[PDB]
Design a protein around this ligand. Structure first.
Ligand code: HEM
Ligand code: CPS
Ligand code: PN0
Ligand code: ZN
Ligand code: ZN
Ligand code: ZN
Length: 462
């Protein structure tokens, strides 16, 4: 009983999410596609995604093999987390990252204070624009990159630092290669790998990004004090590397240190800062909502004191707006692919072993059966009539199951602290004479808002 479907060129790749709406209205919530000899089943809506990732989660936590990553040093015990196959290498790094982030202060007050210190740096770089129009994306990336740089590498960088700039530039470009035509065709057709020029051109920026990290990791190895408890995730990793010398089963090796640190670092940049970029864009398209958040900040926090996570429970409207920015911004619309380890049943359809699953997360965040006004920016999607915060089950921007985004608690903290700090100290607006920016993003693996400019005008002198 396989799922219905049409394939290879009946799929618009310059606007895939809208194409998958058409096939879902045609064939239903679970449909098939055959793309380059790989069988694909697309999952749509909460129940199909939840059935596959939670109910059959034991059989859907694997990823599709990616032989092109062999250039970045990937091997059976060197697989990072994000593209790692389901197995001991993935499980050890995932638990290590999850608990190392926690022990470095994630769920606690030292990280909150760190993030608001970085928000102040970001606020100051905003004020240095003298109320003139500017694209906020670059400074967002730097402020958010410094948070993950702090957790993984034990340091931040100056916004003018050329090494930081190169690091961000290579990462943004290396992300663009993950969803480029060349990358998948050699991952699809493997043999083309050996051809020298094809090997030297693909993942040039991802290989450059890793090279630039090796340089920071080498300096960190110089400054690390093993006689003291690990200050950051790289030190925690290196300590585990030492204990594991002589153990060829450990994923704590030199090949995996650069991959894991790159994984967390690059993920820590591109996600939260893109969401924040949608946030500001939507605050200048909906100044009524901006003003209402600014009112809630004043009644709970004030205009001088820095925000804390203990405020959020008393700020349902600001929490609603932030959730709505993630729901509307829809930053990863087609998720990250999984693959079945067994035959499974989703929505009464049989899905064979070895099928690439596409969790259509956009079809969950914008499900017309679930949300009042899915195609509008509407904070009341997360509010009830008395103004209490409610989170529907369809809020799945981080996916579900054993592979669900391990960054989620850091993202939640960063989103709240950076967002409220910016709105606490500035008033954001479309620039005086410019056309009203689009609310449609540019589709890639990650969906950023269409490029726009804003003006940040302080709310106070003192
Ligand atoms: C707004 C911010 C973010 C969003 C919307 C987001 C979304 C996602 C999604 C949809 C997945 C795929 C889960 C699946 O396989 O079904 C994922 C995985 C992952 N994310 Fe995030 N992410 C965000 C921020 C972050 C941050 C800040 C980090 C690191 C600190 C991070 C690290 C990871 C990692 C390592 C994985 C792989 C998890 C695994 O395979 O076990 N993400 N994320
Ligand atoms: C094997 C078949 C490979 C080749 C190109 C891949 C797609 C692209 O990468 C773009 C996009 C990224 C999202 O993550 C997941 C959805 C989507 C459509 C991918 C799914 C899958 O992986 C594809 C179809
Ligand atoms: C270590 C690697 C260079 S190995 C090859 C792939 N990249 S990448 O820089 O192209 C990348 C970055 C972010 C991302 O999107 C995310 C991540 C996390 N949560 C939600 C969305 C996807 C891919 C690195 C990687 O795996 N990072 O995680
Ligand atoms: Zn350190
Ligand atoms: Zn209520
Ligand atoms: Zn101020």
């Amino acid at each position: 009983k396989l799922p219905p479907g049409p394939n290879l060129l009946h799929v618009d790749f310059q606007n895939t999410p809208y194409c998958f709406d058409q096939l879902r209205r045609r064939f239903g919530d679970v449909f098939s596609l055959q793309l380059a000899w790989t069988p694909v089943v697309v999952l749509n809506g909460l129940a199909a995604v939840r059935e596959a990732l939670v109910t059959h989660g034991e059989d859907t936590a694997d990823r599709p093999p990616v032989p092109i990553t062999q250039i970045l040093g990937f091997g059976p015990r060197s697989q990072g987390v994000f593209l790692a196959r389901y197995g001991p290498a993935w499980r050890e790094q995932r638990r290590f990252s999850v608990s190392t982030l926690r022990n470095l202060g994630l769920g606690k007050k030292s990280l909150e204070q760190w993030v608001t210190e970085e928000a102040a740096c970001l606020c100051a770089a905003f004020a240095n624009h003298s109320g003139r129009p500017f694209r906020p994306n670059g400074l967002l990336d730097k402020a958010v990159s410094n948070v993950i740089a702090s957790l993984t590498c034990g340091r931040r960088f100056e916004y003018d630092d050329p090494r930081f700039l190169r690091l961000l530039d290579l990462a943004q470009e290396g992300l663009k290669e993950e969803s480029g035509f060349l990358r998948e065709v050699l991952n699809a057709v493997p043999v083309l790998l050996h051809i020298p020029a094809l090997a030297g051109k693909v993942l040039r920026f991802q290989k450059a990004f890793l090279t630039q990290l090796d340089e920071l990791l080498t300096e960190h190895r110089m400054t690390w004090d093993p006689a003291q408890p690990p200050r950051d995730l790289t030190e925690a990793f290196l300590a585990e590397m030492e204990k594991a010398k002589g153990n060829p089963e450990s994923s704590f090796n030199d090949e995996n240190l650069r991959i894991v640190v790159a994984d967390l670092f690059s993920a820590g940049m591109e996600t939260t800062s893109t969401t924040l970029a949608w946030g500001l864009l939507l605050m200048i398209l909906h100044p009524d909502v901006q003003r209402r958040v600014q009112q809630e900040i004043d009644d709970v926090i004030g205009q001088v004191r820095r925000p804390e996570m203990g405020d959020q429970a008393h700020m349902p409207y600001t929490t609603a707006v932030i959730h709505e920015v993630q729901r509307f911004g829809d930053i990863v619309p087609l998720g990250v692919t999984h693959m079945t380890s067994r035959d499974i049943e989703v929505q009464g359809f049989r899905i064979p072993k070895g099928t690439t699953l596409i969790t259509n997360l956009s079809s969950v965040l914008k499900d017309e059966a679930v949300w009042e006004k899915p195609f509008r920016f509407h904070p009341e999607h997360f509010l009830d009539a008395q103004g209490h915060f409610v989170k529907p089950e369809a809020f799945l921007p981080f996916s579900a199951g054993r592979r669900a985004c391990l960054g989620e608690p850091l993202a939640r903290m960063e989103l709240f602290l950076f967002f409220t700090s910016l709105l606490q100290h500035f008033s954001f607006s479309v620039p005086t004479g410019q056309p009203r920016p689009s609310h449609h993003g540019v589709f890639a693996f990650l969906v950023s808002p269409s490029p726009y400019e804003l003006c940040a005008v302080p709310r106070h002198h003192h």
